[PDB]
Ligand binder design. Structure first.
Ligand SMILES: Nc1ncnc2c1ncn2[C@@H]1O[C@H](COP(=O)(O)OS(=O)(=O)O)[C@@H](O)[C@H]1O
Ligand SMILES: Nc1ncnc2c1ncn2[C@@H]1O[C@H](COP(=O)(O)OS(=O)(=O)O)[C@@H](O)[C@H]1O
Ligand SMILES: Nc1ncnc2c1ncn2[C@@H]1O[C@H](COP(=O)(O)OS(=O)(=O)O)[C@@H](O)[C@H]1O
Ligand SMILES: [Ca+2]
Ligand SMILES: [Ca+2]
Ligand SMILES: [Ca+2]
Ligand SMILES: [Ca+2]
Ligand SMILES: [Ca+2]
Ligand SMILES: [Ca+2]
Ligand SMILES: [Ca+2]
Ligand SMILES: [Ca+2]
Ligand SMILES: [Mg+2]
Ligand SMILES: [Mg+2]
Ligand code: NA
Ligand code: NA
Ligand code: NA
Ligand code: NA
Ligand code: NA
Ligand code: NA
Ligand code: NA
Ligand code: NA
Ligand code: NA
Ligand code: NA
Ligand code: NA
Ligand code: NA
Ligand code: NA
Ligand code: NA
Ligand code: NA
Lengths: 510, 510, 255
C-alpha cells in the first residue's frame, strides 16, 4: 500500500547528495549541538527512513497539539502518537526559529540537521491525559514526567545518516529495503506481526492463522528500539525470533527488526503501529488482545480494555489503507492439543489453558518446567539462559546501619559461609565508600550472578544510583528484608538467618 | 603415638584460666600489636593447638639456624621446617627481648601474646638453599623473598584463642579433638593421608590399600590452610572430599581438615607432615610419589626426585615414632580395570594409563570428558562447577594504547556484537580511570564469568593490581594477544578479529 | 492359532456361530464380552446391537451349545488402583474409571499422540504406529480441480518444488492418469507408500470408483472442494500457500 501520506519520506535517499555538505555543517564549530537521548535515537531513525511518513521532522506546536487533541496532524492526516524533540530549559534558551541544530549520537556521530520552526513548553498533564489516559503509572506518562525534557523543539530534518547499530546489521531493514525484499520475492500480500515479547506457541499459531486468513506471507516485525520497562532485552528476543521462525513452513515468513520506541499506548499505539507497518510495505497488520497495552496498574485495573485497540483501529478502518487482521484471546485447548481464538469455543463444552506472562517469569525464576505445549523447547532454553533461576542469580546483603557487631567480622563470616556451599557463584565483600563509580557497579555483579556482601549502607542521596534488584537489607528495622533480633545479635545467629533467608528465596539449593 | 617431644603442647588447654587476663592485656592500649599475615595465622594455629609439638612459639635464632642447617631444633629434636614470625624493619625496631607483643587477626581478634626472646635478620639466601633447595621458582623461596618480612621474632606464646574460621566449624579438629574422635571409636590404628588436591580414583585405591596393609582405619587429613599457588581452592576440595568419603566402606574413614600452611618442601615437608600427623593421633602416615613436591620449574627440571621424600622419611624412621606407609606411582590398568602400584607390574606385559594434573585442567578448561575410570562422576561435576570450561569463563579485551580508532565506538561495537551471541554471559564496557579500587575489581568480574571491554590500558605502575588471567591485549604491538594490522584498522575488521580470537580460544561456541 | 474365518459382524447371531466354531476347534470355553461381533453404531449414532445382546442370545442357547460361555461386562481401567476390572463389579462413583475407545485410539495413531502406558503395551503401540503412521508420514494427493483456469502444468511444478523444500523423507510426484484405470488404481498404492501426489486433472466420474478417496484432496472453487479457491484464475503463489497451509493444518507437514 502507498506509504501514509502518499510519499515515503526516506530522507536518507532524499538528502544523499547533501551528505558531505550537511556533514561539514554538523561538525562546524559554530553550529549548536544536541546529543539525542535514547528514545530520540529511535524516533529520529523512523523519521529519516520514512517509517513515520508523512513526518519529516519533530512536530511543531501546531501539529503537536493537533495530535494530542485530534489524533491527527494539523493537515488532517491520521496520526495518534506525538513525536517531539524534548530538551531542557538551558538548551531551549539558546535557540530561536530559523536556527539550525546539529543532532548527534553519543556526542560523536552526527545524525542530522534540524531547522527550528519553534520552541514551546508543552503542558505534560494534557499530553499525559489525552494521549496516554492519565494514569501516573502508565509507562509513557512516567517517561514524560521523569525523563522527557520540558521543552519541545519543532523543526524539519535533513538526514546525514541513520543512528548507528553494530548488532544485527542485516536485519534492521528500512521501509525501502523491506519493500525490495518483498518484491524480489513477489510478495504482494504480507501480514505484519508486531511484538515486544518472545514468541511462544500461541503466537506462532496466531500468525499462521493470519497468513491463512489473509492469504498472505508472514512478516515478523519485532521492536528492538524501546519497549515496556522490565521486558526481555531484544538480544534474547531476537535469538528467540530467529529460532521460532524455523517452525514456519519454508519460505512463508520473513524477519525484520523495527527500531521503534514504543509508548505502550494501547489503542492509539495500535493505530500508530498500523501506519508504521503500512509505510514499511505490509498489506495487513495483526491486532490481538491488549495490543500495545501495559497490563494493569498497581491497583489491578486495566490501562486499556482488552479490545480497545481493535475498536479504535476499526473506526479508522477506511482511512488506514492497510487491512487489519483482528484476533481475540488465543488460548490452548488441552483435550484437543491445539490453540484457537477464544471467540470460537468455550461454551464450557471445552476446557482451555493459559500461562500468563506473570506465571511465565515465575517458572523462569523458580527453575520450573515450562509445558511443551506452551512454548518450544529451544525457545525456553534461550529464555532460561538469559533469565536464570534463583540458584544462578546474583544478590547483595547490605549490613544495615543499626548493626552493632563488627561489620568486618560479620562480612568475613558470611563470605566464608557462602564459599562452602559451592555452585559456581562468585562472592565478594564489596566496599562502596559512597562513591557512585562503585555503587553503579553493584547491579553489574548481581547481573553477573555474583553474590555481594556490603558492610555499610550508602547515603540516601545516592540510593538512586543502585538498582534495588536482588538487594537485601539485613537490619533490626521493620523495613529490613532480613530482620535481626537485636543490633548486637551474635554473628553465627545472624549468619544462619541470612543463609536460611537466601535458601528460602531459592538462591541456595542443597 | 606420643606427641613429638613427648608432650602435646595444647596451649589453648594450658592457658585456659589465663584467658581473661591475656585478653585484657591483648587489648590494653599500651601493648605493641602485630597483625598476623595469612601464613602466620596458619602457623600460629598449629602451634597453639599442639600440632607443632614440641614448639610453643616462633623459633628464636638459635633454634631457627639449627633447623636450617641441622633439620633439628637446638636441643636435637627432629624438625625440618622453620616456623618463624616474619616482620618488617619498622616493626622489628620497636621491640627488644622481654617485650610482650599482642598478636591479632584482622586487626581485631586477639590471638595470643608473644614474649620476645630475640629479633634477628635471617639470611634468606641460606634458608632458601638449605631448606628449599635454592631454585628461585620454588614456592617457598618466592614467598620468602617476595612476601615474608626480612626480620624474624623468636619468642614464646600464651594462647588467647585459635584463629577464627566461619567455614566447616565441625571439621577443623584439633589434635586433642581428633584423638578423642578416634578413642570414642576405639581406633588405635589410623593411617593418615595428606593432600592438597582433589581425590580421584587412584587416591581412593591408594588409601584403601594402605588401610589394608596397615590394618588401620583411614584418616583423610587434607590441607585447608595454604598450599601451592594455583591449587583448587579448599572449599571445592572439601566438597570433593566429603563426596568421595562416601565411596569408602561404612565406618572405615574419618575426615578432618588441617589448617596447615604448606611450603611445598618435598622431602623435608614430608618429615614435617609425619611429625604433624603423629601429634594429631595418627599411627601411620602415607608418603607417595613426589610427596609435597611442587613439580618441575620452567626449565622442565624436578624440584625434588619423585622419591626423595620417601628416602628422607626412611632415614629418620627410627625416631619419627610413627609408621610410614610408602607408595610408588599408583597407576591405572585398562586391560584389568583397576589401579595398582607401578612397582608391582609393568614388564610391558601390561598396559597402564595416567591422566596427570596438567591434562586434567585441560579437559576442565576445554569441556572435555573426564574418564569414568579416572575419577568419580560426582567429583568431576563439583570440579567443573568450580572451574568452568571456556564457554562459561570470563575475560577482558583491553583496547591497546596504539589504538587510533574511536575507543568509544569500538567499545560499543564489541559490546553489541558479544550481546547477540547469548549464552548467559554478562558484558560490560569497563572504565578503570587508573583507580586501583576499580582495577582490583577486574578479576572479580572475570571470576564471575563476565566479559569486560576495557577501552584503555592502565599505567604500568598499576599493572600489578590486576591479575593477568584471561585478560587479552588488542594492539598492533607484537606483545598483543590479539594483534591488529594497523592502529586505525576499521572497527568491523577489529571486531571480527576479536570475535574469532575468542572463538578460537573456546570462549564462544556456536 | 489363526482362524481363517470370514466374519459377518452379526453381533448376537455371530456370537452363537463363533461359539459353535470354537467348539468344533476343541475349545471347552468361549468368551463373550461387550458388543461381541458388533459393528458399533451407524451414521445416525445408533447401535447395530445392544452391548449385551450377544450374551443374552448365547445364554438362551446355553443348554445346547455344549461349550461353556464365559461372559464379560465392559472391562475398564481403574486409575486410582492401576488395574482393570469388569465394570459390573465397581463404579458406585466410589471409584473413577478410564476408557480409550477404538475411535480415540486411531486419533492418536493418526496425530502422533502418545498412547498411555496403562492402555496398551509399548511393543504393541510401536507395531501399530509402524503400520498406521501419523499424518507427517502419510501419503496424499492434491487433484487440480476442473474449474482451474491457471496453467495446470506450472501449478503442478510449483507444488512439486514447494513440497520438495520441506524434506521429511516423503517422495513426491506429478501424476498424470489419462483416465486410464491401470494408472488410477495405482493412486492409493502411492498414498499407501507414503508418497505425495500432484494430479493435474480430475478423472471422469465414470471411473471415480477405481480410486480410493483416502487422503485425496480436491483443489477447486467448488463448495465440495477440500481446498477451496477464491477464483479459478487465482495466482499460483496464492494457490500454493493455500495448499501448503491446508496440508500443514492436517498434519501432513510439521515444521
Ligand atoms: N493470546 C493472544 N491472543 C490474541 N492476540 C495476542 C495474544 N498474545 C499476543 N497477542 C498479540 O500479539 C501482538 C504482540 O504481542 P506482545 O508482544 O505480547 O505485545 S504488544 O505490546 O507487542 O502488543 C499483539 O497484536 C497482541 O495483541
Ligand atoms: N599416583 C600416586 N602414587 C603414589 N602416591 C601418590 C600418588 N598421587 C598422590 N600421591 C600421594 O598423595 C599424597 C598427597 O598428594 P597431593 O595432594 O597430590 O600432593 S601433596 O603436596 O599433598 O603431596 C602424597 O603422599 C602423595 O605423594
Ligand atoms: N472392554 C471390554 N470388555 C469386555 N469385553 C471386551 C472388551 N473389549 C473387547 N471385548 C471382547 O473381546 C472379544 C473380541 O473383541 P474385538 O476384537 O474388539 O471384537 S469382536 O468383533 O472380535 O467381538 C469379544 O468377546 C469382545 O466382546
Ligand atoms: Ca519537568
Ligand atoms: Ca482485564
Ligand atoms: Ca544485647
Ligand atoms: Ca626484603
Ligand atoms: Ca621426573
Ligand atoms: Ca590507515
Ligand atoms: Ca451404546
Ligand atoms: Ca480473475
Ligand atoms: Mg541504525
Ligand atoms: Mg580455627
Ligand atoms: Na494504497
Ligand atoms: Na565521548
Ligand atoms: Na482481506
Ligand atoms: Na474500553
Ligand atoms: Na484509502
Ligand atoms: Na518463605
Ligand atoms: Na579493621
Ligand atoms: Na649460596
Ligand atoms: Na607395622
Ligand atoms: Na634425589
Ligand atoms: Na612410640
Ligand atoms: Na588456532
Ligand atoms: Na438389545
Ligand atoms: Na449338550
Ligand atoms: Na483446521
Amino acid at each position: 500500500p502507498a506509504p501514509h501520506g502518499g510519499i515515503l519520506q526516506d530522507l536518507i535517499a532524499r538528502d544523499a547528495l547533501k551528505k558531505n555538505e550537511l556533514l561539514s555543517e554538523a561538525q562546524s564549530s559554530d553550529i549548536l549541538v544536541w546529543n539525542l537521548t535514547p528514545r530520540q535515537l529511535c524516533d529520529i531513525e523512523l523519521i529519516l527512513n520514512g517509517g513515520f511518513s508523512p513526518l519529516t521532522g519533530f512536530l511543531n506546536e501546531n501539529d503537536y497539539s493537533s495530535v494530542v487533541t485530534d489524533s491527527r496532524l494539523a493537515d488532517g492526516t491520521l496520526w495518534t502518537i506525538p513525536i517531539t524533540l524534548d530538551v531542557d530549559e538551558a538548551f531551549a534558551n539558546q535557540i530561536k526559529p530559523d536556527t539550525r541544530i546539529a543532532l548527534f549520537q553519543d556526542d560523536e556521530i552526527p545524525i542530522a540537521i534540524l531547522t527550528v520552526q519553534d520552541v514551546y513548553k508543552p503542558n505534560k498533564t494534557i499530553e499525559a491525559e489525552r494521549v496516554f489516559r492519565g494514569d501516573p503509572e502508565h509507562p509513557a506518562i512516567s517517561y514524560l514526567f521523569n525523563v522527557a525534557g520540558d521543552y519541545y523543539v519543532g523543526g524539519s530534518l535533513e538526514a546525514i545518516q541513520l543512528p548507528q547499530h553494530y548488532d544485527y546489521p542485516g536485519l534492521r531493514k528500512t521501509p525501502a529495503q523491506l519493500r525490495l525484499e518483498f518484491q524480489s520475492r513477489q510478495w504482494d500480500r504480507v501480514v505484519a506481526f508486531q511484538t515486544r515479547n518472545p514468541m511462544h506457541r500461541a503466537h506462532r499459531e496466531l500468525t499462521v492463522r493470519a497468513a491463512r486468513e489473509a492469504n498472505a506471507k508472514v512478516l515478523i516485525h519485532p521492536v528492538v528500539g524501546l519497549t515496556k520497562p522490565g521486558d526481555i532485552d531484544h538480544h534474547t528476543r531476537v535469538r528467540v525470533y530467529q529460532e521460532i521462525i524455523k517452525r514456519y513452513p519454508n519460505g512463508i515468513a520473513f524477519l525484520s527488526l523495527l527500531p521503534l520506541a514504543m509508548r505502550m499506548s494501547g489503542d492509539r499505539e495500535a493505530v500508530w503501529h498500523a501506519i508504521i507497518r503500512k509505510n514499511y510495505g505490509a498489506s495487513h497488520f495483526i491486532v490481538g488482545r491488549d495490543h500495545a497495552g501495559p497490563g494493569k496498574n498497581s491497583k489491578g485495573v486495566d490501562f486499556y480494555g482488552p479490545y480497545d485497540a481493535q475498536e479504535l483501529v476499526e473506526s479508522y478502518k477506511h482511512e488506514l489503507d492497510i487491512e487489519v487482521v483482528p484476533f481475540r484471546m488465543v488460548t490452548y485447548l488441552p483435550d484437543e492439543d491445539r490453540y484457537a481464538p477464544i471467540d470460537q469455543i468455550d461454551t464450557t463444552k471445552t476446557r482451555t489453558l493459559n500461562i500468563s506472562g506473570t506465571e511465565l517469569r515465575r517458572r523462569l525464576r523458580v527453575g520450573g518446567e515450562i509445558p511443551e505445549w506452551f512454548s518450544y523447547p529451544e525457545v525456553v532454553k534461550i529464555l532460561r539462559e538469559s533469565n536464570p533461576p534463583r540458584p544462578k542469580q546474583g544478590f547483595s546483603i547490605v549490613l544495615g546501619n543499626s548493626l552493632t557487631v563488627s561489620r568486618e567480622q560479620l562480612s568475613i563470616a558470611l563470605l566464608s559461609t557462602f564459599l562452602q556451599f559451592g555452585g559456581g557463584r562468585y562472592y565478594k565483600i564489596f566496599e562502596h565508600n559512597n562513591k557512585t563509580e562503585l555503587l553503579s557497579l553493584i547491579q553489574d555483579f548481581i547481573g553477573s550472578g555474583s553474590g555481594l556482601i556490603i558492610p555499610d549502607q550508602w547515603e540516601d542521596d545516592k540510593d538512586s544510583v543502585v538498582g534495588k534488584q536482588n538487594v537485601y537489607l539485613l537490619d533490626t528495622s521493620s523495613s529490613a528484608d532480613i530482620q535481626l533480633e537485636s543490633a548486637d545479635e551474635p554473628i553465627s545467629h545472624i549468619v544462619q538467618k541470612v543463609v536460611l533467608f537466601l535458601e528460602d528465596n531459592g538462591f541456595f539449593v542443597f
